[PDB]
Design a protein around this ligand. Sequence first.
Ligand SMILES: CCCCCCCC/C=C/CCCCCCCC(=O)O[C@H](COC(=O)CCCCCCCCCCC)COP(=O)(O)OCCN
Ligand SMILES: CCCCCCCC/C=C/CCCCCCCC(=O)O[C@H](COC(=O)CCCCCCCCCCC)COP(=O)(O)OCCN
Ligand SMILES: Nc1ncnc2c1ncn2[C@@H]1O[C@H](COP(=O)(O)OP(=O)(O)NP(=O)(O)O)[C@@H](O)[C@H]1O
Ligand SMILES: Nc1ncnc2c1ncn2[C@@H]1O[C@H](COP(=O)(O)OP(=O)(O)NP(=O)(O)O)[C@@H](O)[C@H]1O
Ligand SMILES: [Mg+2]
Ligand SMILES: [Mg+2]
Lengths: 585, 585
Amino acid sequence: LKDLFRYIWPKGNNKVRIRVLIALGLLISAKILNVQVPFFFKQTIDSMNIAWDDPTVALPAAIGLTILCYGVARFGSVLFGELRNAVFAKVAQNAIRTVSLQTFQHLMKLDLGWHLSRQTGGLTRAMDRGTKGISQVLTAMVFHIIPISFEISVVCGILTYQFGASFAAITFSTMLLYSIFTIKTTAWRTHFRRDANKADNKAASVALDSLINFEAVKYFNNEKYLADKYNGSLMNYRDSQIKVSQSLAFLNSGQNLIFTTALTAMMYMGCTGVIGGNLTVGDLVLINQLVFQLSVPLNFLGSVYRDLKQSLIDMETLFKLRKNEVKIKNAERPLMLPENVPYDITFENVTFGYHPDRKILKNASFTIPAGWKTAIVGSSGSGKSTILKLVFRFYDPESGRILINGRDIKEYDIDALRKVIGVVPQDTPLFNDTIWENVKFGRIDATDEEVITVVEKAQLAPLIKKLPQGFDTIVGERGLMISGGEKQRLAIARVLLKNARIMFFDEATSALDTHTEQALLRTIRDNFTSGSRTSVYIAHRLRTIADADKIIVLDNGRVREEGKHLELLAMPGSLYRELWTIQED
Amino acid sequence: LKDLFRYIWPKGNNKVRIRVLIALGLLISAKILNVQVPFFFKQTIDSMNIAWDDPTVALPAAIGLTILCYGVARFGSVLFGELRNAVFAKVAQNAIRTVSLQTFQHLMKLDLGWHLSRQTGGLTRAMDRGTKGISQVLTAMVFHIIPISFEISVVCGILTYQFGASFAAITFSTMLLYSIFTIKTTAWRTHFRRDANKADNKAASVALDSLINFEAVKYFNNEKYLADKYNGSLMNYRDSQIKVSQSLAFLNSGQNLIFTTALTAMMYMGCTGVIGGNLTVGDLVLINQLVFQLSVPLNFLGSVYRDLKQSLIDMETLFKLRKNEVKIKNAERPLMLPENVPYDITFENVTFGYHPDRKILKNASFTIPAGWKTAIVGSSGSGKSTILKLVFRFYDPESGRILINGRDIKEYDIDALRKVIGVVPQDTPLFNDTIWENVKFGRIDATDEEVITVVEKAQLAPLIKKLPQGFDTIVGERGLMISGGEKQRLAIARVLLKNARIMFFDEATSALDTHTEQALLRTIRDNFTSGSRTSVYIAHRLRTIADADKIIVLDNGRVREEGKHLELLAMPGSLYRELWTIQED
Ligand SMILES: CCCCCCCC/C=C/CCCCCCCC(=O)O[C@H](COC(=O)CCCCCCCCCCC)COP(=O)(O)OCCN
Ligand SMILES: CCCCCCCC/C=C/CCCCCCCC(=O)O[C@H](COC(=O)CCCCCCCCCCC)COP(=O)(O)OCCN
Ligand SMILES: Nc1ncnc2c1ncn2[C@@H]1O[C@H](COP(=O)(O)OP(=O)(O)NP(=O)(O)O)[C@@H](O)[C@H]1O
Ligand SMILES: Nc1ncnc2c1ncn2[C@@H]1O[C@H](COP(=O)(O)OP(=O)(O)NP(=O)(O)O)[C@@H](O)[C@H]1O
Ligand SMILES: [Mg+2]
Ligand SMILES: [Mg+2]
């Protein structure tokens, strides 16, 4: 409940502070009128209690005027309440916008290991629940918590100042018992609430992880297994929610029992005071109406805001997302890459592990030169795409250096380094919109003719002619509404559009036939000058990297061989020779 | 609001019907006591209005008893309210469990084209919002809509039967104006509500489609573009929510103005009646308290249930999910596949298109024989995986037949057909749990030794030894926390575990090196007898399908060539010959 106060009452921006102060003033005045209306009611009561000696007499003007004042005060209370609602809505919605956008920006700033460890549906669910929790927390703390507190305070003061100290003792002992009971009961309901939250999260995790792999669910006939798992989670959530609802019923019943005992004790004290010729029926009316219109709001907002602590939990998960750690960040004095030169990557005694318990790279050292086409090869699980994610600075090594033109990539603006490097990754999840905006995701600021020409160079024009909604065909969930080769070609088109200098191709020809593959590689190596771009091909089809100027063979996270094609093929004891042997026959 | 009544009041299961009837009875009695308490208040008032001639007199017993009855009726009202809450909670949670499970089952029953066209995050968001909407709709329709309606009815009746017909006219004209105003105002707020819903859905779609492709977002430096898109959606949602909150404030203010005019008119009528020696101050107290304790609940539940129509929209989207169409369903008299025989697929003049405007297969006809290893090849976008999804009966063709052992696959139980067919798909999205339960997803009812031996046959033992948490390593979001070859090998292991008869391999060696590839194919073709399984390899590395007994070459959705390796290679004019030529040099 602190960060929220930092968003609704921030440093600077006196506009929102003035808005909050006006909301507070309207709240105050609303409660003042809601507490003053019963005095007008008492006045009209005690003024009508006289003996009228003529049934035809017209209503005196004083009583008409005080009834008018009663109605006007009731209306004014509700009116100020609603104006407060409006103003603080204008405030809370700005707060929610701000926090949602900041959280999105951060999520975009975080590292990869933090996103892969977590399920995206979980992040979106947390964000939605947290925005709704902010909304409910505010809608409750400025409509039905602070106002009822102010009203309780002024009611205690009135009943202590106008009807003696007895009523004061009654009210204070009542507040004491109310607090004790609510405390000892929330300490016992929190358990069921926690269980229900856990079970709901588990059930949603199951549903999501199942719908994502719907194919891999039907392919193996495990619908019933997952449905029974979901049903178990749901049956735990059901029992927990039932128990918390029963406990909340018990809570509210006991609260209202305490309050009603207080109310009847107040009626009895006022009645034995009227007996003593001190008070009057007007006083009983006043006391009972004060306490009753203070009570029924309390009971109803307590039984209605049955979900407010869960809202705090959601909001806190959201703020935790917003306050995680950014492992990859610019230095204090970040440089910027050269202007017009070919780039040269260099791994110097690097050693990296996605987790501290395993080392994927064991003292790797090599040189990806400038203007040349190098090709990385090796066994699977050997640390090829790991290099590709180090240079792009998704992770940073634990020991060693990554140099570009002789400067560690930590001395560079990450956003300036990630703008000269263009990657065709292994997995190519696209968007759920047209082919147009997915090919135009490389250079948003691109003229459509460039999109068209790179599409023609990525061997995509035939597909675009066959499809009847060419350049508008929706490609469904992460690209599943098209082929696997077409996704590779869309990614290659994105990369040709970025028009970068260092081009990584992590198996961009694994789903393409030999014809399309060779045509595409020819179109690529013939698009750029012979000394401009620095290309790195992660290849398992060693026939596509035969024209490479430097082949980097690595195994078990260590560079074993380095050299051109024939220098390795015509050399005994070479792993590349064994791979080419098994590839030839 | 009809399907909900079908879940809370179903055919059979008299238990839930009796529970609902008891909840209704408790609601009735609660409102009865809440309407009777003011009569006790009036009695004590009019009994204390006498002139006491001794300040020391003790309180008579009748007045003490009627005050006791007043407090007891207040407590009983709240108590019955809370018991009703508990009971109907036990009912509504069962309803929610039932609907969630049925919706999940259906989603699992629907076809693929329905899942690919939609984003899974959207489905999970709809389900969550719909469950919360069911909860809120019930919590509002049995706590603060039906009860207030019954109370309004009995209040109208009382004020019509006990204080003449004037009060009746006042109350009925008040209800008329209230209704007219609320109608003409909701007709004007629905627009802002719709706009806000649209914008929230758009913003969430953006956030999701961006977090899923976080890699493809950072790889191209389009964080700011997506953040500005999100901010635009959020700034539309902000203005719309602001406008609906202001409009709701105006609504509630006008409602309470009408109600307060009614209240003051009632006070004036009662006062001019007291003038006429007919009524008494007790009557004014009674009227005003009835109307006031009927009012403040109404106003507060109206300003609190600001989100109830959106809940209906969510619940209706959920029920629509639950009432979509199942294109793929068993026949009326479904057969079951033979017991112990090799299966033989046969496409007979088939013609299929994922959408009615394009035909991926143009009169395809061929025969995947039994006990043999056939291999499908052809250009990309040519309709290979389409076959693989037809046989598995994800879609059904528009013209033609798919035969297994001479019987159309429509005359078979889909769940019996999908249990003899094991697929290694192109895209292999795994789960977010250990390698163990992802290799044990083929045959859940498998002894761990089989898991271990298939893992050893899928060339995964080395990885399992290297990892320090072997067989427990979490594989992150859809398998991104491991290699791309390791995912292929996990899928091949799943398939070897299913121990099926018809094995489809849609490019299961695209990320594996030649060494692992040949070792794995050898381990596979040597695991089963030479005439048991029927294998279909979708291959782009034509060196892995040279030992095939039948190669099916298709282009532009039509089978062009069919025959063994050399029969096509040593034949001029063959597409397979051109592919092998481009693959050799
Ligand atoms: C989390 C937030 C917590 C904050 C807590 C702060 C609140 C502290 C409590 C305040 C004590 C107020 C006690 C009021 C004493 C006055 C009682 C009284 O008789 O006043 C009434 C009604 O006035 C009325 O209508 C009285 C209404 C109250 C008057 C001022 C309220 C205080 C405003 C403070 C602004 C922040 C006047 O009617 P009469 O019968 O003519 O009284 C004759 C006596 N002069
Ligand atoms: C979406 C749902 C819509 C459903 C609508 C149905 C409701 C229809 C409305 C009902 C009209 C009720 C009219 C009540 C007339 C009785 C008024 C009255 O004077 O009764 C009071 C209080 O009783 C009381 O406490 C009166 C309380 C009401 C008595 C019965 C209520 C009806 C129960 C129906 C059950 C379904 C008795 O106090 P006294 O001063 O002693 O009265 C002396 C006269 N005998
Ligand atoms: N839901 C879909 N809606 C429309 N078209 C689709 C859909 N799914 C696949 N396609 C298209 O239908 C054509 C053939 O699809 P597909 O059967 O996957 O080819 P493929 O043989 O798998 N190519 P590849 O896997 O790369 O070797 C292509 O034009 C696809 O883009
Ligand atoms: N988030 C991760 N956490 C732990 N291990 C990982 C993670 N990501 C990748 N790995 C592991 O690190 C090792 C090398 O990963 P990787 O760099 O992707 O190999 P690769 O060269 O891409 N193989 P392939 O793409 O199939 O040719 C493998 O054992 C992976 O399983
Ligand atoms: Mg890789
Ligand atoms: Mg395919």
